[PDB]
């Protein structure tokens, strides 16, 4: 159930029918891998199987040494936060003398425990791998002797299975300076991530959504290497909590809009600079100017408030009547009359200024409709490919209904006489005052 409208007046398109999945806050969890305080062993035999585990154990001993070494459009309007601050905060909580013992004592006999830290926060805690119970109990007392013998070849292979995950965890942390994203299946397997979500202090609708899009729960999560103390290796996974769900969203698409004069440099240009994602949130509209930070799965839209503006709900009025009394819609000015196509959810915006040859094609027979010079639009219904100049555009073959909103292009309402052509961030009531300053004042003189 997806719909889309295009405004012939403003060279812009709105795509309604998308559901919200906003990331309001973060949740922190503490992953642990119990380790093995082990030194240079004593057995120096030449048995083929022994030299295999002797070098495999050095992979464990050096992987620990490596982590130990670590611990010694309007994006200019957006704010600046520290995404991993919540996880780094929990990390420094784990430094305090006694905080690591609480985790091991609560993980002494179970592989999952709810620990209340010093600062009065309950964090889900996970013990993920038993290398200590295998190396200390079955492997170390043989190597730390003079001569040592390995029973089975299958023991070597079984060791490689156990040691592999720890090496691949170290591999990511060594290459990402202790902070990795998206959180790989090594830092958290689907079985572990889903058991986290089901036991997070969150809503049953909140778990329903996370479970269906774990591939997007991963891209919006961080894993932070924290401490390796005593015989414990703990790294914090910072999972998102979605506090605004199932509200209606809509995506605005904008392209340059110029006059249609034939002579060079005789054209004035205007472009709507409020494109991006919009979703209803507590009576206001959260505007994400960077649509790249939002991720679209089917009709669900996962965004991060860190890349949002909290705007009044009057911004929605900027679609029907652009001027209006309530909200002052934002626009940029220029004189660059260059053709460019923008692909929307159910179509593609066509701006064909100049000598550019712009057309819309079908896979049975291309170039079914031709565009005159100006900013026009055609639905994806029946159209497969679109060409503007030397750039061929493939239109989204997603189904849905289209609606063409007709109107006179707004650029014809402006006198190109003293039209300010270098207003990067301005607005309509600011453009009209930019008119009166060069209209009224020059008239009186």
């Amino acid at each position, epitope marked *: 159930n997806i719909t889309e409208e295009f405004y012939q007046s403003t060279c812009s398109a709105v795509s309604k029918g998308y559901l919200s999945a906003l990331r309001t806050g973060w949740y922190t969890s503490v992953i642990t891998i119990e380790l093995s305080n082990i030194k240079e062993n004593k057995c120096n035999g030449t048995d083929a199987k022994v030299k295999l585990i002797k070098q495999e154990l050095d992979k464990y001993k050096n992987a620990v040494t490596e982590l130990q070494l670590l611990m010694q459009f309007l994006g200019f309007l957006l704010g600046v936060g520290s995404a991993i601050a919540s996880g780094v905060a929990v990390c420094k909580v784990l430094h305090l003398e006694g905080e690591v013992n609480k985790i091991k004592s609560a993980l002494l006999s179970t592989n999952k425990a709810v620990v209340s830290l010093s600062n009065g926060v309950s964090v889900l805690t996970f013990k993920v791998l038993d290398l200590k119970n295998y190396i200390d109990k079955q492997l170390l007392p043989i190597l730390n002797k*003079q001569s040592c013998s390995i029973s089975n070849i299958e023991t070597v292979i079984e060791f490689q299975q156990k040691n592999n995950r720890l090496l691949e965890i170290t591999r990511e942390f060594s290459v990402n300076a202790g902070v990795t994203t998206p959180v790989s299946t090594y830092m958290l397997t689907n079985s572990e991530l889903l058991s986290l979500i089901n036991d997070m202090p969150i809503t049953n609708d909140q778990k329903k959504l996370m479970s269906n899009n774990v591939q997007i729960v991963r891209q919006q999560s961080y894993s932070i290497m924290c401490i390796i103390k005593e015989e414990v290796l703990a790294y914090v996974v910072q999972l998102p909590l979605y506090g605004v769900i199932d509200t209606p969203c809509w995506k605005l698409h904008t392209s340059p809009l110029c006059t249609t004069n034939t002579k060079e440099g005789s054209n004035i240009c205007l472009t709507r600079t409020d494109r991006g994602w919009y979703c209803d949130n507590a009576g206001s509209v959260s505007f994400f100017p960077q649509a790249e930070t939002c991720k679209v799965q089917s009709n669900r839209v996962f965004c991060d408030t860190m890349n949002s503006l909290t705007l009044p709900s009057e911004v929605n009025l900027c679609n029907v009547d652009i001027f209006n009394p309530k909200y002052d819609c934002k626009i940029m000015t220029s004189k660059t009359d260059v053709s460019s196509s923008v692909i929307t959810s159910l179509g593609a915006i066509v701006s064909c200024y100049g000598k550019t040859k712009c057309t819309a094609s079908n896979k049975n027979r291309g170039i079914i409709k031709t565009f005159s010079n100006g900013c026009d639009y055609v639905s994806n219904k029946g159209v497969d490919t679109v060409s503007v100049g030397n750039t061929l555009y493939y239109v989204n073959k997603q189904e849905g209904k289209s609606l063409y909103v007709k109107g006179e292009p707004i650029i014809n309402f402006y006198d190109p006489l003293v039209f300010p052509s270098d207003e990067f961030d301005a607005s309509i009531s600011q453009v009209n005052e930019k008119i009166n300053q060069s209209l009224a004042f020059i008239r009186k003189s």
Partner: antibody
Amino acid sequence: QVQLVQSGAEVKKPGATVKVSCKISGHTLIKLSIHWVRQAPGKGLEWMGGYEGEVDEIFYAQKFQHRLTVIADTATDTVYMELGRLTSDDTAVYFCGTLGVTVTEAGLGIDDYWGQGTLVTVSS
Amino acid sequence: EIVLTQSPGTLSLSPGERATLSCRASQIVSRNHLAWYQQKPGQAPRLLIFGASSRATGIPVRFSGSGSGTDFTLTINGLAPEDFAVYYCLSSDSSIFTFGPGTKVDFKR
């Protein structure tokens, strides 16, 4: 460079009690197995008793359990054997040796460290 | 109690020949807990083969162990002159050690 150095030769009179030492250098007693093995002149090897450092337990063969004591001093890495009511049948060379074998599921390991022996001649 | 017997008493062979030394138990002994020791006159015992077939650190490849249950076999595949001494087998059941009578490897004349 592990080295096990025993006490010197002893001469004891019938019915006496002999103390033989085994001092450990280059290694720790709590990770070692230390057992006493004696060899009468021209005869085979005979195990008497020992101490397993990993478990901190002392074992005795039933033939000598009534008159043999083994002591483990972890602070000085020294193990003693104390054998009383000696007879001419006890005239032998006494060795301390790491006989213990530790077995786990991945495999099994052993130490092979020995002293130099201690001669005990028992006659009146 | 476990009573270990070895055979033959004296094994007479020349360097380059194969030595085959037996050790047999009155009751089943654990394969992990049977070892082969070498003792030359005047010296302390020396471990050759532990855990039935495993070889000790720094023992030549010519020494090989085998055996299970009650019958065990130390095999020297090509005797060297330093190998002519006494070879004892050693079993252990619940940390109770018992030594074999001893097999002596002799110079064949």
